[PDB]
Amino acid sequence: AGINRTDQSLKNPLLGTEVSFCLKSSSLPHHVRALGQIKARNLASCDYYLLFRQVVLPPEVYPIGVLIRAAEAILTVIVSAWKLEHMTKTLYSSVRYALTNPRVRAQLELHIAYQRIVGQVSYSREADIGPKRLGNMSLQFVQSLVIATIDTTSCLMTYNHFLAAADTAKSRCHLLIASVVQGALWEQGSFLDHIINLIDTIDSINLPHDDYFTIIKSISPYSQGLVMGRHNVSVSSDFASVFTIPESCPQLDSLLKKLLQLDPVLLLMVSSVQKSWYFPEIRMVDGSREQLHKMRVELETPQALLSYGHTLLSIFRAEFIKGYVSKNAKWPPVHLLPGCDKSIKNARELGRWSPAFDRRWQLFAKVVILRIADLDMDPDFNDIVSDKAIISSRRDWVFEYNAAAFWKKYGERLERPPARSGPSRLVNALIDGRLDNIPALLEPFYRGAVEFEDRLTVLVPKEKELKVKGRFFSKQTLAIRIYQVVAEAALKNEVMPYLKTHSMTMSSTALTHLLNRLSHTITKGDSFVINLDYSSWCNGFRPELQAPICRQLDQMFNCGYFFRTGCTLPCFTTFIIQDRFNPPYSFRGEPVEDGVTCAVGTKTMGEGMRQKLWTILTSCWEIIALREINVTFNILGQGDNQTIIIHKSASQNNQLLAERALGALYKHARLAGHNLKVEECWVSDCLYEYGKKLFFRGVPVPGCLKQLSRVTDSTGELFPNLYSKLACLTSSCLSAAMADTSPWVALATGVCLYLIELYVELPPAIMQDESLLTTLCLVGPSIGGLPTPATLPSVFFRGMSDPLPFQLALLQTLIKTTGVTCSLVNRVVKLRIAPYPDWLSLVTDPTSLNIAQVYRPERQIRRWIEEAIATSSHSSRIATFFQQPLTEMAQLLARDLSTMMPLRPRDMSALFALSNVAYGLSIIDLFQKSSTVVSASQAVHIEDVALESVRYKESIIQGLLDTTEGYNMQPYLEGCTYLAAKQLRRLTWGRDLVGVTMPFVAEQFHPHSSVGAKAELYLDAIIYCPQETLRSHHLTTRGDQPLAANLVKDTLVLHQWYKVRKVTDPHLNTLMARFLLEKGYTSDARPSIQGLTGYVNILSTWLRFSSDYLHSFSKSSDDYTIHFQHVFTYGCLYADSVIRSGGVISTPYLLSASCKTCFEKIDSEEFVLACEPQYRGAEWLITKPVTVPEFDPCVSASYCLGILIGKSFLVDIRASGQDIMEQRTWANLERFSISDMQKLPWSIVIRSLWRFLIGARLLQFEKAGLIRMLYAATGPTFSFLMKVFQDSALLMDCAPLDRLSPRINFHSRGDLVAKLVLLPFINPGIVEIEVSGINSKYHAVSEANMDLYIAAAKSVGVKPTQFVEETNDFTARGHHHGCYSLSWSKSRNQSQVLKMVVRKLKLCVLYIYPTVDPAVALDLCHLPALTIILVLGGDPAYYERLLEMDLCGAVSSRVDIPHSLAARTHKGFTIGPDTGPGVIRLDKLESVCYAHPCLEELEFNAYLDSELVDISDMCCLPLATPCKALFRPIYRSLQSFRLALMDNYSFVMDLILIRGLDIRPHLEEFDELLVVGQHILGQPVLVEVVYYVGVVGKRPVLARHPWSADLKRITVGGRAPCPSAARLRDEDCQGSLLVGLPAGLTQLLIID
Amino acid sequence: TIQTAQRCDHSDSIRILGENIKILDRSMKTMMETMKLMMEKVDLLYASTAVGTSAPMLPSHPAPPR
Amino acid sequence: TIQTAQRCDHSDSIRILGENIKILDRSMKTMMETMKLMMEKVDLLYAST
Amino acid sequence: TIQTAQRCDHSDSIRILGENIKILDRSMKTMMETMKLMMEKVDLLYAST
Amino acid sequence: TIQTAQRCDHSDSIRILGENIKILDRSMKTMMETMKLMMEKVDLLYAST
Ligand SMILES: [Zn+2]
Ligand SMILES: [Zn+2]
């Protein structure tokens, strides 16, 4: 007969009506066979967990030790392949402990016994399968009913009960292995004993069914209540007192309290599992009656409900108009009724939103919003085909029930028709063509009278939930489903982007910023969280609330009554409940109302219907409730669950504000008819939940136990097979690893579950061979094997990766370490090349090969389903779409794209994605692999899949047992895997493939420690520096260091990206023109447009990493094959493996470049498509055709970068203090290259920046913010401007700047940058000369194409050469010029004596410890013919600080960098240690005249090797042009300094008038420049000047003595003529400075 | 010439007629809003009556245009 | 020339249609009044249910 | 000035505007009769209740 | 003379106001039919009570 028991997992609710019908008066042939085989003691069907819990097997029945050894070998191979050999002992000991421990082994053997019974009985043609023994339990299967017996008690149940027991055992096996692996790799130790104690404590509950599942349902909110009760600091919590766990199960209470005592995070991890225990049997009578009561119960009157609906209409109008004014910069089409307020009229004419309409929303009862758009009454094929089952017509309600139940219950027959009167699925409605005319179907919803044959909804219970009375979803008629699709699409597209509360949730960036700000603020004491749960949300909504906003939405879209028909529709809709063996009565072919199984009309549509409107209504009443009490709030909505963030006010504390907020929310929830129970709501300052992720104190709680213990449905769209099981297991481990579970835990668990899944299905000949099992686990789908979790690089990385180099590296480690020869690898892989190239597999998966996939389950996919639908299609929308073969067009386009002369598969797939045939194949893919398309594809030949499963099983056993070898892979498993992968692709595809092979990062970089590293390792290495000694504390505590028609748009973006990098081909332009014609765009031209992985993110905040690989790969503009995110993730994984193995990080470490053939220079190469394309376009696949309305690059990019950096500084000064610490910019400035900045001319950029700042003409507060944040070291763009201006060649090449540099006096490099960027506000003097270089055409260059011009900017320019300046050299006898070395503010004599010592000792190399002051090292580096090798010990911070100070580049040329990073100890002649051989020391001499022709007086006498060597007889040699170490901005001539004296006097007097800026530090800069003045003034210099400053008559009068009483005293001290430049600059013809002097400058000259 | 132009000129007349048709349009929009508030109450009353019986869904809006 | 400009304008008909527009305004006002009265009637219906 | 005379042409437009105003007036009288009939029906509400 | 004759005539403005009164006639027709649809429901409400 037909196939029986067709499920292998629980996908249905547990019901016991059939068991009751079988025990009471059944006459069916198999019910008698079920009744005859029960015992005297028969338990009820709801007590199945009382019988399945007593099942015990004998110990150690399955010989699984070979699996243990194989798992250890697999993990050893993976860990040795990643070259992290210190985690090796940790991971296989967790696997060995898990499979040897008796309770986990017993659970695993129970799982194997259950799954072998499932494999033996499922998909069989035999109705009755005999005695199947499970330990002490004997099982008999009688079709859908199962009889289980241990000794003398029996339970007659359904097959879903047995699947629930098997899924319980499977979930517990997952839970125990995940618990062991998590306990081995985590700071708190093993927690397996609490898991076993939890299992025994729940298993020891001897209560009825309802109380048992009440405890299981309330086990999680009670534990969250305990965590909230002990760990709230600002609000009170009474959530723990609701639950009856302390009075029902005391042992469970003690266990949860001791888990609270050890670790609350462990309590939240353990308590979050809810499906590792059994599942309830739903009481259908009471739950059905309760639902049919709650859908028609009134808590509030209709008259109050309509008034509150009008109130919600007012705030809906207010928020919608606010959104439209914020986005479209104008009022929508509005109508002002009589009696409207005048502020509404004035704001309508002025086009503005006033900041007083938020609290006055009652004024918007007079503003009718007119038509803004039109309703789209043609849904696309994505939402039409999937996710729901339907009913064709109301004469098909008789096919959901049994006829024998209707005969026994009611005494008459059912009068069922023979045929089922139409389709039972959406896709069958497409093939039969009932969805050919959607507006003709939705016209009854427009007129307000839907037809009588469409008003039915079957309420179906949900599965795997802990409610004993059930939760029900809706199965509906096709017409109501199309109404739902159109209405939800209209609200999602046109209304909710204008509503701000939903729009911050829809945007990923705004939601991410909100969650980060919530994470930082709860720990400080603000922004407490209120959680609201609506238990009767979907049943509680009423028509009288929804009708006004539905009327407004119908007026907005020019659709009559379309949104208002759904509110009054439940009053006319027949509702029945799907319960076989309990059917409703039929009177004249229609159901009869009884209140339990049928209800003719309710007051709500149901669950999930009208989801978008109900969220808007809920947000509206919450905004009313919180705006009436003056709070700052943010609502995070998840439908029935609402999370509200309320910020602290200065006047009130959090508790009183929380009580007021709870009262307001309860009041305004009650008025809408949704009464919030006090037992279901809570407030917290430590716990909140969003996105199925639970956060405790702002840190996400681990979800390893919940995610790895989840049971998936598997075998999707196919017969049961091993490949789909391995695919869903691998996908589950990948999804867990992406959702913040540790990669090692998911990997080890996946290896264990992979071997158990093989042990279920494979014979003992395969499974007692260890080497075959290891090789079979390490082949993977990249080279044609089974899907394995071991071969995925996406577990540890987030971006796009290449599997093939990793796969070949794993096999090389397998052959070299494990005793498996290459012949066994040839045996397992069986590499079989295809005779002909199939280019469609390349354009779908660019990284794939042309090899045969023999283990893949075979549905023909490409042609059979197309032939079936083009033959059985009876109407339109299929004959039009499939009038030509899509696969032959796809292959023809693939052959057209295979004529690319450099064959780039990534660009080939990118051009294939912009074709209509790709969209057609996507629609066929949804016809094959989606939800509810499994029904048709499995129902066609429903019997044959049972034979196909056994055929696939015999084929895979015969394939795995076959001992013949395939293609020899020995050349591809030796040497570098990059070239091996490229040669394998060239062998298999026949042509060379460029641009798809990414090198494996563990072969490309190798980790070391700096304690034993040599000089040659530091040539190409990436350095990591920890700020502290790192332990397991820092893995969780954050540190100091920071972290449709759019295809036309995509086509033009790609067209611009091709054209800007100068690829030019007539055939490519023809092909993109054909794409533009098939998508309806007939216009000829349009030119329009750190961070890591999340598992190492917290530890990355304790590490400083940089790119010092520039000795061989980053010194040129040529790009190479390094993907840097993966390298930084790999280094942080090394750090994580050191910490989690019991080690510490106290020394800096490195990643050295090891494989030289993994570093390939990428060929930026034009691709020419040779042959003429034969594609010709389609034009029948897009149903909505879009309409046609719908200089050198260096200077343009210079002006655009200048205005972008200026507006970035503008949004930096408008940013708050919490925002400037973030690296967010206006137009994504961070992810730009550094080399193209060196190619770009920056003089044009500086003039564009200066002209944008003088064109802004900001107010005084913003200018004060500019000067304040640029004089300090704040702002991300200031760091960007430093990183740009790191090289001094860009400093010297700027032709304004070498003229400007005599004027400005800079204390540091950043001071010079700050003066350069904010000089035009304070000084227009050089602006009068270089304002003439303006060009208005370059100002008009748009910001949208700036990335395109940057992609043009990289190739044109060139980098400069850098120049080495000179300082004093001394040596031998000569003339004394001036002996100038650090005269600005530094101990110059310390440099003097060390230069004299190093020059008379004739040393060739000098070693400098980091205890030496940096400027002495700058002088010693600028000495020629000397090699300075510092002592870093792995820390590049001292050399970077040494390089930031200098302005020539002699520190970047005379320092040997690998020997500096490879130095730790004394190895030569040193300056820096206290006493030793070859150590230069400084001794203080109190009194010496220092009789030297060069220098006048000595302070420090230099001693060396416990001796003094006479440095008093040397002299100088001639000098050359100097660096900025001599500070030529203040040189001998005074007219540049008098211009500086003219400027700084003008600087302060303008900045006094600037509002919000108190001039203390800028006055200190003026004080230093006037100290340089006081060196030469000649009047007696007061050390302390009282220095009164004040403005009189809009003229700032500032001097020592107070000219007027309004002047303000500023205390300035420390003035002394300490530099020797005072004697130098004393010149002839005094009074020349008085010529052309301001009278105020004369007053500061002559002191008092 | 000027006299024929001054009897042919009706800028003020056409502006007055256009403004008066705008008054007509505003009064009609006001009447439509009041009629919609009437429709809400009559449809909710018939919907509350219809629960539990076999009353048909009567039409509320006439027809789509064309 | 003069007779063509005489043909292309009808000022008296403009005055008559403006008076008819005023009549239309009066009819619109009295329809708003009777809509207000039947609004009151339907409101006092829906209050007592 | 023939083409300017054809662009001066208003004789058809004023006549068809008069037709539009006439049919608008008839529509408002028919709807006013409907309003009176509707008031006569809705006054029966408190007679029945 | 010429620019004064430009100021005399706008046929496009007359056409816009003709369409503007035609759409108001359409609104009258829709309100009449919708109000009869209300009349059927209130008639069945009289029949119910
Ligand atoms: Zn390599
Ligand atoms: Zn320098």
Per residue, what are the HEC states of A803-814?
A: HHHHHHHHHHHH
Chain B environment of A303 (Cβ under 8 Å): none
Chain B environment of E10 (Cβ under 8 Å): 14
Give the number of whichever ligand sits closest to the CA of residue A1159. Answer: 1
In angstroms, the separation between the Cα of residue D48 and the nearest Cα of chain E is 7
Task: Look at A439 and B44 and tell me if their CB atoms are within 8 Å.
Answer: no
Angle between helices A803-817 and A65-81 (to 10 degrees): 120
Q: Name beta bridge partners: A156.
A: A147
Q: Please tell me the distance between residue A1520's alpha carbon and the centre of ligand 2 in angstroms.
A: 13
Alpha-carbon Rg for chain B in angstroms: 24
Q: Name beta bridge partners: A369.
A: A334
Pairing of strands A456-461, A1608-1609: unpaired
Chain D environment of C34 (Cβ under 8 Å): 32, 35-36, 39
Chain B environment of E17 (Cβ under 8 Å): 14, 17-18, 21
Non-local (6+) Cβ contacts of A357 within 8 A are: A318, A322, A343, A347, A363, A364
Decide: A837 and A972 in contact? Cβ < 8 Å: no
Handedness of CA A1595, A1598, A1601, A1602 (dihedral sign): positive
Chain C environment of A339 (Cβ under 8 Å): none
Q: Please tell me the distance between residue A903's alpha carbon and the centre of ligand 1 in angstroms.
A: 23
Q: Name beta bridge partners: A690.
A: A693
Distance CA A797, CA A1406 (A): 44
Distance CA A211, CA A215 (A): 6
In angstroms, the separation between the Cα of residue E28 and the nearest Cα of chain D is 7
Residue of chain A nearest B48, judged by CA positions: A571
Which long-range contacts does A658-665 make (Cβ < 8 Å, 24+ apart)? A658/A235, A658/A528, A658/A530, A658/A683, A660/A629, A661/A530, A661/A625, A661/A626, A661/A629, A661/A631, A662/A530, A664/A625, A664/A626, A664/A628, A664/A629, A665/A530, A665/A532, A665/A622, A665/A625, A665/A626
Task: Look at A337 and B33 and tell me if their CB atoms are within 8 Å.
Answer: yes
Q: How many CB atoms lie within 10 A of CB A644?
A: 22
In angstroms, the separation between the Cα of residue B42 and the nearest Cα of chain E is 7
Residues in chain D: 49
First-last CA distance in chain A: 118
In angstroms, the separation between the Cα of residue A376 and the nearest Cα of chain B is 14
Residue of chain B nearest E20, judged by CA positions: B21
Q: Please tell me the distance between residue A462's alpha carbon and the centre of ligand 2 in angstroms.
A: 75
Partner chains of A (3+ C-beta pairs under 8 Å): B, C
Q: Please tell me the distance between residue A1530's alpha carbon and the centre of ligand 2 in angstroms.
A: 16
> Which residue type is seen at A813?
T
Query: Does C31 lie at the interface with B, CB-CB under 8 angstroms?
Result: yes
Select from A548, A565, A601 the Cβ nearest to the Cβ of B50.
A601
Give the number of whichever ligand sits closest to the CA of residue A1121. Answer: 1
Residue of chain C nearest D43, judged by CA positions: C41
Distance CA A92, CA A68 (A): 9
Task: Look at B52 and A593 and tell me if their CB atoms are within 8 Å.
Answer: yes
Task: Look at C47 and A302 and tell me if their CB atoms are within 8 Å.
Answer: no
As given in the structure block, the two tokens for residue A23 are: 């025990």
Query: Does C18 lie at the interface with B, CB-CB under 8 angstroms?
Result: yes
Decide: B62 and E34 in contact? Cβ < 8 Å: yes
Distance CA A12, CA A18 (A): 14
Give the position of tokens 């700036």. A1346
In angstroms, the separation between the Cα of residue A441 and the nearest Cα of chain B is 12
In angstroms, the separation between the Cα of residue C9 and the nearest Cα of chain E is 9
Q: How many CB atoms lie within 10 A of CB A863?
A: 12
For residues A1406-1441, b (16+ Cβ closer than 10 Å) or e, as one string? bbbbbebebbbbbbbbbbeeeebbbbbbbbbebbee
Pairing of strands A128-134, A137-142: antiparallel
Backbone angles phi, psi at A1251, to 5 degrees: -75, -30
Pairing of strands A1588-1591, A1479-1484: unpaired
Query: Does B58 lie at the interface with A, CB-CB under 8 angstroms?
Result: yes
Domain ranges of chain A: 284-301+375-700, 799-989, 1001-1043+1090-1158, 1191-1362, 1388-1508, 1529-1648
Query: Does B19 lie at the interface with E, CB-CB under 8 angstroms?
Result: no
Query: Does C8 lie at the interface with E, CB-CB under 8 angstroms?
Result: yes
Distance CA A1426, CA A1406 (A): 7
Residues in chain C: 49
Interface mutation target, options C19, C32, C44, chain B, most CBs of B under 10 Å: C32
Task: Look at C9 and B4 and tell me if their CB atoms are within 8 Å.
Answer: no
User: Strand, coil or helix: what is A834?
Assistant: coil
Decide: A485 and A507 in contact? Cβ < 8 Å: no
Query: Does A807 lie at the interface with B, CB-CB under 8 angstroms?
Result: no
Pairing of strands A1596-1599, A1149-1153: unpaired
Query: Does E9 lie at the interface with B, CB-CB under 8 angstroms?
Result: yes
D–A touching, 3+ CB–CB pairs within 8 Å: no
Sheet hosting strand A41-43, strand order edge to edge: A41-43, A153-158, A145-149, A137-142, A128-134
Residue of chain E nearest C35, judged by CA positions: E35
Decide: A76 and A93 in contact? Cβ < 8 Å: no
Partner chains of B (3+ C-beta pairs under 8 Å): A, C, E
Angle between helices D11-42 and E11-48 (to 10 degrees): 10
Task: Look at E37 and B24 and tell me if their CB atoms are within 8 Å.
Answer: no
Nearest of A58, A42, A27 to residue A136 by alpha carbon: A58
Query: Does B16 lie at the interface with E, CB-CB under 8 angstroms?
Result: no
> Nearest 5°: CA angle at A826, between A822 and A828?
115
Non-local (6+) Cβ contacts of A1232 within 8 A are: A1350
Give the position of tokens 């530091």. A1018
What is the resolution in angstroms? 3.1
DSSP letters spanning A438-455: HHHHHHHHHHT---GGG-
Note the helical H segments in chain B. Answer: 2-8, 11-50
In angstroms, the separation between the Cα of residue A341 and the nearest Cα of chain C is 21
Query: Does C1 lie at the interface with A, CB-CB under 8 angstroms?
Result: no
In angstroms, the separation between the Cα of residue B16 and the nearest Cα of chain E is 12
Helix (H) or strand (E) holding A731: helix A722-738
> Which residue type is seen at A617?
L
Query: Does C38 lie at the interface with D, CB-CB under 8 angstroms?
Result: yes
Chain E environment of C35 (Cβ under 8 Å): none
> Nearest 5°: CA angle at A507, between A506 and A510?
125
Chain C environment of A302 (Cβ under 8 Å): 49
Distance CA A453, CA E39 (A): 25
